Amino acid sequence: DGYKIVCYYTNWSQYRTKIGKFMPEDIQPELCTHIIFAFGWLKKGKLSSFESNDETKDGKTGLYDRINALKKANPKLKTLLAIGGWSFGTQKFKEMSATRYARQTFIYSAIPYLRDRNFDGLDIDWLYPKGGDDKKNYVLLLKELREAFEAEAQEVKKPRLLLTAAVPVGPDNIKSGYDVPAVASYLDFINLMAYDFHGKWERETGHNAPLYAPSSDSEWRKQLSVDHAAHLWVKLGAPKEKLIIGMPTYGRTFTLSNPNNFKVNSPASGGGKAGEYTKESGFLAYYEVCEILRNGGAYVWDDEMKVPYAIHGDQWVGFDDEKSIRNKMRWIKDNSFGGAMVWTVDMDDFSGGVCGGNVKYPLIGAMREELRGISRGKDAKDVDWASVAAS
């Protein structure tokens, strides 16, 4: 019971190098209440593996089992397998949801797939259903999934498989694809993707996940905040306690058109340069932002948005730190939402050796501390970037 801490683990984090290298055993069993495995896949209309080393074969334990092995040390921990995401696209979801036969084919493939691999549930990450057909068919998919999960539980006399989904924060995306009252009814809980509010696809700097929109925001764009998105879902009929609010352990980066104009909503020429470990322009892991702040980068706290950004030369990154995360946890409690979701567990300072505070998982550890009252350790102090970094 209490607030949830829902952590996404991404299987491609296994390929990162040096400090970035992450494996299932790097997760502390007591860190999260739920771990979601990103991702499974779809083949011939049925739930399947993303990559062969997810599976256990011949002598060799796969990633699925290494993640689920965490439940031996913490029997209260729940695991789910996610299907979807950006690589997956939309066409495969369209075809799988379009007819009852295709939906049932997926569903009766999904139940044994999960049970045989000791998963406690399924997370749907269709990004995104769009238009009237998708809007109806998505509901039909969740309805028939929940239906079948309910029946299975009673027949096998085991706790029912959980059904969850990751959902968008953009008002237009929400309106086009989501019959919210029906969607919420069939889901156990809802992982609100409260990040990617801004990024290199825009011509000015903007924060990845502002709690509140800056005053320099046009009036369309002030809709783009964590606060506005979460309350929009409530207004549309989602129960507050089913809303698990996403928290990014990453930032979105820009290259400033002029290094002297570095505030939020400043002209940008494109994405920030790629980090060594995540190798993606416009994007940095939290521990990559830490490296910047520990090597000459300047830190700005925006008291309007209640989030920080960092500047180094013409490089600009909007990210979340221990300060903004704790304030967001207070906002979760003040609004009675269901808990925090994290994207991802593998981009926090999981080794505890990069950001300088010598605490493993400073960000997620802070979430657990604020929401579930569990200490990060005796002398675990937040990094005060205001004094540590430049200004």
Numbering used by the authors: 91 to 481
Publication excerpt:
Here, we report an arthropod-conserved insect chitinase belonging to group III from the pest Ostrinia furnacalis (OfChtIII), which contains two GH18 domains that act without synergism according to enzymatic assays and structural investigations. OfChtIII contains 987 amino-acid residues and is composed of four domains: a predicted TM domain (residues 7–29), two catalytic domains, GH18A (residues 94–461) and GH18B (residues 530–889), and a CBM14 domain (residues 922–976). The two GH18 domains of OfChtIII possess similar structures and substrate specificities, which differentiate them from the chitinolytic chitinase OfChtI-CAD. The degradation activity of GH18A and GH18B (or GH18B-CBM14) in combination towards EGC was equal to the activity calculated from the sum of the individual activities, suggesting that there was no synergistic effect between them.
In addition, the structures of two complexes were obtained: wild-type GH18A complexed with hydrolyzed (GlcNAc)6 and an active-site mutant, GH18A-E217L, complexed with intact (GlcNAc)6.
